[PDB]
Amino acid sequence: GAGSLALSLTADQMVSALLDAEPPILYSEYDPTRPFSEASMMGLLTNLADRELVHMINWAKRVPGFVDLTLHDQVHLLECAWLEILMIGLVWRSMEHPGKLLFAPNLLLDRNQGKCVEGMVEIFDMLLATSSRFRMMNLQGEEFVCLKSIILLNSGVYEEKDHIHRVLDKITDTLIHLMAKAGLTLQQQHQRLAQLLLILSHIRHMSNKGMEHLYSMKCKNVVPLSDLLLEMLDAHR
């Protein structure tokens, strides 16, 4: 990606570009009857996540620097990052719902409704903890879209590895700009940058555990998975 537009954006244009790329907030096409079974819970989340994936593909294309890559590399990055991206989206929209996960405006679950599925309460607790940390830090929308982009570009990274590195540097510059603009001292900026990036290691962690569980669910044959979802799972073995 030598010569790329992405690398000569201002911080403010990078943010404008990322804001314009944002997917819509999806409603669940079903309201659950009450209570949940394993199968009804995994049905709602699987259905919601398949629909989110379609919109995440359109978003990825509008991320500066993403479409500079080979289609091969674009596929690898989304295959590696998709559940981290669903997760950062979930913890962001759950920030104003303490103790609750806003899967959709018509699908708000507390940690208890996680108990009907094996291993799910542990994940919910880690998602809740991440949401609470974002609330404590007062994460801003402009910071969130920068982080979501870092996840996409970073999660499968290990000309075209150096290109991804130059785009990641540009997104770092953007976060620091946003922070300076908001009146943080140079010390507060560097500290907040580190705090946000250390949360990406927790999101990577939740994704690796999530994927283990999706693979167990696959073999269990509890719910139909879409061909797309099966592709994403085969990618992780």
By the criterion CB under 6 A, which residues form the site for ligand IAT? 42, 45-46, 48-49, 52, 86-87, 89-90, 103, 117-120, 123, 210, 213-214, 216-217, 220, 222, 229
Has 122 been labeled as part of a binding site? no
Instruction: Report if residue 168 touches a copy of itself, rule: CB under 8 A.
Output: yes
Cβ distance to a copy of itself smaller for residue 53 or 153: 153
Q: Please choose which of ligand IAT, a copy of itself, none residue 8 contacts, taking the beta carbon within 5 to 8 angstroms, the exact cut-off set by kind.
A: none
Instruction: Report if residue 212 touches a copy of itself, rule: CB under 8 A.
Output: yes
Instruction: Report if residue 216 touches a copy of itself, rule: CB under 8 A.
Output: no
Has 236 been labeled as part of a binding site? no
Alpha helices in 64-154 (DSSP H): 71-93, 120-137, 141-154
Binding positions for a copy of itself, 57-86, rule CB under 8 A: none
Instruction: Report if residue 220 touches a copy of itself, rule: CB under 8 A.
Output: no
Determine the Cα angle at 75 with ends 164 and 72, to 5°. 80
Has 213 been labeled as part of a binding site? yes
Instruction: Report if residue 173 touches a copy of itself, rule: CB under 8 A.
Output: yes
Q: State how far the Cα of 36 lies from the Cα of 32, in Å rounded to an integer.
A: 7
39: tokens are 């199968």
Chain breaks in the chain (C to N over 2.5 A) after: 158
CB burial readout 188-216, b (16+ within 10 A) else e:
ebeebbeebeebbebbbebbeebbebbee
Minimum CB distance to a copy of itself, residue 125 (Å)? 8
Print the binding letters for residues 178-197 with a copy of itself: x by CB under 8 A, - otherwise.
--------xx-xxx-xxx-x
Q: Please choose which of a copy of itself, ligand IAT, none residue 130 contacts, taking the beta carbon within 5 to 8 angstroms, the exact cut-off set by kind.
A: a copy of itself
**Distance from first CA to last CA of the chain, Å, rounded?**
30
46: tokens are 């699987």
- Select from 88, 67, 234 the least CA-distant residue to 153: 67
Q: Please choose which of a copy of itself, ligand IAT, none residue 220 contacts, taking the beta carbon within 5 to 8 angstroms, the exact cut-off set by kind.
A: ligand IAT
| 8 A C-beta contact, residue 22 and residue 59 | yes
70: tokens are 């080979």
Binding residues for a copy of itself (CB under 8 A): 125-126, 129-130, 133, 150, 154-155, 157-158, 165, 168-169, 172-173, 175-176, 186-187, 189-191, 193-195, 197-198, 200-205, 208-209, 212
